[PDB]
Structure 1
Amino acid sequence: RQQQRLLREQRRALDCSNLNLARQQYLQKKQMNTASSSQPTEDYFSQFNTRSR
């Protein structure tokens, strides 16, 4: 009976561990999603004004 209680406790501890792992992975992908898609600054616009030929 005590070994069955120990098995239940070990499963609960592992479940809390990957719960906290799930939270930090959610924050990791939430700052992953904002860093791919691109926007052009004024440095992309300023070169097409220069040059008069």
Structure 2
Amino acid sequence: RQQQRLLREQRRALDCSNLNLARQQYLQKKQMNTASSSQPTEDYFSQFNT
């Protein structure tokens, strides 16, 4: 019975870690999301005036 307790203790503890883990890559994928799309600046309009 003690082993059964230890097994589920491990299972819960691992479940604690992955839920902790699961939150960061959700942040990380958002960091990926807003890092690709681009916008041109006025530095691309001034040179054509010359």
TM over 0.5: yes
Mapped to 2, the partners of 1:23 and 1:45 lie a distance apart of 42
Choose between structure 1 and 2: higher helix proportion.
Answer: 2
**Sequence identity (%):** 100
Question: Which runs of no fewer than 5 residues in structure 1 stay unpaired?
Answer: none
Give TM-score scaled by structure 2 length: 0.90
Alignment root-mean-square deviation, CA = 0.8
Secondary structure of 1:39's counterpart equals coil
Question: Which runs of no fewer than 5 residues in structure 2 stay unpaired?
Answer: none
What corresponds to 1:33 in structure 2?
33
Aligned residues: 50
In the TM superposition, structure 1's runs of 4+ consecutive aligned residues that sit over 6 Å from their partners are: none
1:1-44 deviation digits (Å, cap 9, x = unpaired):
01001000101111110111110110111111001011111111
